[model samples]
Target: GLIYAVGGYDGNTHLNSVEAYDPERNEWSLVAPLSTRRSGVGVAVLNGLIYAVGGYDGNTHLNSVEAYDPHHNEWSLVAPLSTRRSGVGVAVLNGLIYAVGGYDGNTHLNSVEAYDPERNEWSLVAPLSTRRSGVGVAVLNGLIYAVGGYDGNTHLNSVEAYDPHHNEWSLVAPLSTRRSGVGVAVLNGLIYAVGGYDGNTHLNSVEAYDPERNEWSLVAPLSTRRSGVGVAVLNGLIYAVGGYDGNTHLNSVEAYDPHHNEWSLVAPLSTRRSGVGVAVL
Candidate 1:
């Protein structure tokens, strides 16, 4: 398996550059850059291709979607989402790609949409319980979990779970600390949320949730505080990738070992970025 770093901002401008990291070789190489420059894009890997959904292009929040075929080294335009949004959260479940809450430039959005590859169309889904932007979402066991994000008024610690089978959104456990721009990934039946802004400052804190207990517990913290961090699971470990580390954008990457409850520094990325979307394939 390899890790893919998708669209994000690099402080001065939005980016469309994409890179693939081979943990085995500890090296990264550019595959194919996006057709349009964007930041905070939602990404998901489905049917052996990478789908890049809505994001900001420094002009408007975009609803445009594109699919990249790594095998052919090409990117093809796909059906756009229903809403123009930035900072969207996306996941694949039951053979469909779900796009979660985000900002549409005007307001925080509770709207959700699902993409069907066979029909090449997008349909609306049940909205989130609360309006959110910069949320962390993951699909596990056919359920989509939307974690902490900013709702405009304040940083949100609240979480929600979406049952696609039932077609509804339900409230779940809340984080111990309010955070926006958090990074989340599931490992060993646990949801791990990493660094984010807690309203006051960027955070280095990490928390783990156990669905069975319906509670979140403290875990090993990251060495650096990060906002807009990218997270992915590879080889049973959680990899925390590039993000804004308070004063500067970060290229550093770290891995968490659940067994030891520790985080160790891994090979850094070639470029500094924040608001990155990470996928494992």
Candidate 2:
């Protein structure tokens, strides 16, 4: 199995370079770079293709989208979104790629959009109840959960779930603490919210949400605080990729084992990155 790290900021500039990790070898190798540089991008694997959704491109928020073919080691431009977004959250549900809220240069957004690979087009979907940039999104039990994020005015602790069939979003239990730029992924039927900022400082605290219980519980925190982290579940483990701590951009990686409720260090990336996008194939 391979975990792919897409474009992100490396402190100095927005990045277009991509890398793939080989778990068996415990190493990462360069892959085809994206056509446009991106930071705060959202990535999801659909079918056999990896979709890199909207983010900032140094000069402006991006509406452009691209897909990578691992077999060919190449990326091709796809249909663009209706609006440019940065710090977007993305997930695949019911064969559709959903791009959740993000900043649009002018304002924080609550609007959501979905792409149909077969139709090669993006259509408007129901908007979230709150405008959230830097949101964390994951699919659990067929529902799209939009986790904590910033709402321009303040870092948010509010969480919501989208029912695609009904085209609506409703409130869910909020995180135990406010978080923006959080990393979220589902494992063992529970949704894990990893490190992010909470307005005052970068946080290392983690939490898990139980849908049946309709509550959030504290979990083991990351070794280092991470804001703009990339999260994905591969095999039976949840991996947290690079992000920025309060002082510096980080190349460190962490893996969480739910059975033990613990996080352990993994191989570091070649370069420091924040706002990275991750996917497994």
- Candidate with best lDDT: 2
The TM-scores of all predictions, comma-separated, are 0.98, 0.99
How well is each residue in 94-194 modelled by candidate 1, as lDDT tens digits?
89999999999999999999999999999997999899899999876669999999898989999999998799999999999987888988999988889
Candidate 2, residues 1-281, lDDT tens digits: the string is 79999999989999999999887788888889999999999999998999999998899999999999999999999999999989999999999999999999999999999999999999998999999989999999989999999989999999999999999999988999999999999999999999999999998999999999999999889999999999989889999999989999988989999889889998988778799999998
lDDT of each: 0.89, 0.93
lDDT of 2 at 60: 90
Off by over 4 Å in 2: none
What TM-score does prediction 2 earn?
0.99
Output the number of the TM-score-best candidate.
Answer: 2
Candidate 1 residue spans exceeding 4 A from truth: none
